[PDB]
Amino acid sequence: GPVSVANHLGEDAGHLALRRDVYSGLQKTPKSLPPKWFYDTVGSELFDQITRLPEYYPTRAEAEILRARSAEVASACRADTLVELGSGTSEKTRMLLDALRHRGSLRRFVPFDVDASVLSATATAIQREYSGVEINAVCGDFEEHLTEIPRGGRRLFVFLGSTIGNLTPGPRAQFLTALAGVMRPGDSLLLGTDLVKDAARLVRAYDDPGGVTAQFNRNVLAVINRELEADFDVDAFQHVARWNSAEERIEMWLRADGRQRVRVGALDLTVDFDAGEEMLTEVSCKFRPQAVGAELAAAGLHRIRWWTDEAGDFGLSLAAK
């Protein structure tokens, strides 16, 4: 099938965005950085390791559901077009593509992500694996370019991994509203949400004894040091995973041990850390079944299927426009 890739981001858009997030985030109280910047090359490779840890159940729990339910996804949505809000590199992507193709309705794959080189590799992989499928990769970001997704016949939008949990309620409602805005009647959204559960299990999933998550978290400082000529003493920042009971979310923090002064050279910026000051690097909201259905409703989408894994650890929602 034909491949296309459309790039709506400027060549330096990634670097401009990083400059903005860091100039802004290192000046908030508390300091905070968005989790999208964990995922450079080293960081993406560390994330792969995390998904294979015994502590980190979300990846396998979601794959367990999709292994068992992809055909039920395919029969309810009846999509001819799979839109992945993501890079399309995972096994789950092929599980859904396999199920739409088993149905015979699969015509088009639309991976939508911010890294055009990954999208190009993904498009070549799918083109080699799925004959007669057209791939229309779209390089754009959520806040501007969701309108540039092709119309197709009937579209299944896919947002897996409980990545929606990185948005707190305010931004999360804005995102779901905008996504529902670009969907057309007859489209559907497959959404993965990690579920509230025993808090000790949740912390463990974000602070494995082997230290992999700690290295993943510390890597954002390495990314800033490298990309913006900074002098974070990375090992002076301790990994801290917290359960926030009242907000029902995991939080990843980096805790300064002793006072630190950090100079970000590209930004002409100097910031100060108190001894014990913690900086927020990721929010991971955990959900309850009924609240996910209500948040989808508030955005204009109607949930028509809900599936958990055998342990009730992880949820998949299918919601139609």
Please give the residue whose beta carbon sits closest to ligand 93I in the complex: 36
Min separation Cβ 161 and ligand 93I, Å: 4
The total number of residues written for the chain in this structure:
321
From candidates 81, 87, 93, 136, binder to ligand 93I by CB under 6 A: 87
Residue 35 or 315: which CB sits closer to ligand 93I? 35
Nearer residue to ligand 93I within complex by CB, 135 or 252: 252
How many residues at the interface with ligand 93I, by CB under 6 A?
Answer: 15
CB-nearer residue toward ligand 93I: 161 or 315: 161
Cα–Cα distance measured from residue 144 to residue 174, given in angstroms and rounded to the nearest whole number = 13
Contact 222, 33 (CB under 8 A): no
Smallest separation, CB 88 to ligand 93I (Å): 10
* Least distance in angstroms from the C-beta of 233 to ligand 93I: 26
Q: What is the DSSP letter of 114?
A: S
Positions in 14-73 near ligand 93I (CB under 6 A): 34-36, 39, 58
Nearest to 134 by CA among 107, 97, 103, 104: 107
Residue nearer to ligand 93I on the CB measure, 70 or 284 = 284
Which 98-157 residues touch ligand 93I, going by CB under 6 A?
113
Minimal distance in Å, beta carbon 227 to ligand 93I? Answer: 16
Q: Is 109 annotated as a binding residue?
A: no
Among residues 161, 187, 182, the alpha carbon closest in space to that of 82 is found at 187
- The minimum distance between CB 51 and ligand 93I, in angstroms, equals 9
**Contacts with ligand 93I in 163-192 (CB under 6 A)?**
163, 165-167
Stretch that binds ligand 93I, among 3-11, 128-136, 161-169, 229-237 (CB under 6 A): 161-169
142 is in an annotated binding site: yes
Q: Looking at residue 40, what DSSP letter applies?
A: S
The answer to whether residue 159 forms part of the interface with ligand 93I (CB under 6 A) is no
Distance (Å, rounded) from C-alpha 226 to C-alpha 307?
42
Q: Has 57 been labeled as part of a binding site? A: no
The residue among 192, 197, 167, 198 whose CA lies nearest residue 306 is 192
Helix (H) or strand (E) holding 308: strand 302-308
Q: Note whether 146 and 184 are within 8 A (CB).
A: no
Residue 23 and residue 72: Cα distance in Å, rounded? 46
Q: At what angle do helices 13-25 and 212-228 cross, to 10 degrees?
A: 110
**Triad 180, 185, 190: Cα angle to 5°:** 55
Give min distance, CB of 163 to ligand 93I, in A: 4
Residues between 209 and 268 with contacts to ligand 93I, criterion CB under 6 A:
none
Choosing from 111, 161, 293, 315, the residue that interacts with ligand 93I (CB under 6 A) is: 161
DSSP 163: G
Contact 298, 42 (CB under 8 A): no
Residue 162 in the binding site for ligand 93I (CB under 6 A): yes
**Residue 14 Cα distances to 46, 55, 62, 224, angstroms:** 21, 32, 29, 13
144 is in an annotated binding site: no
- Chain residues binding ligand 93I by CB under 6 A are 34-36, 39, 58, 86-87, 113, 161-163, 165-167, 284
Binding residues for L-histidine: 56, 166, 206, 282-284
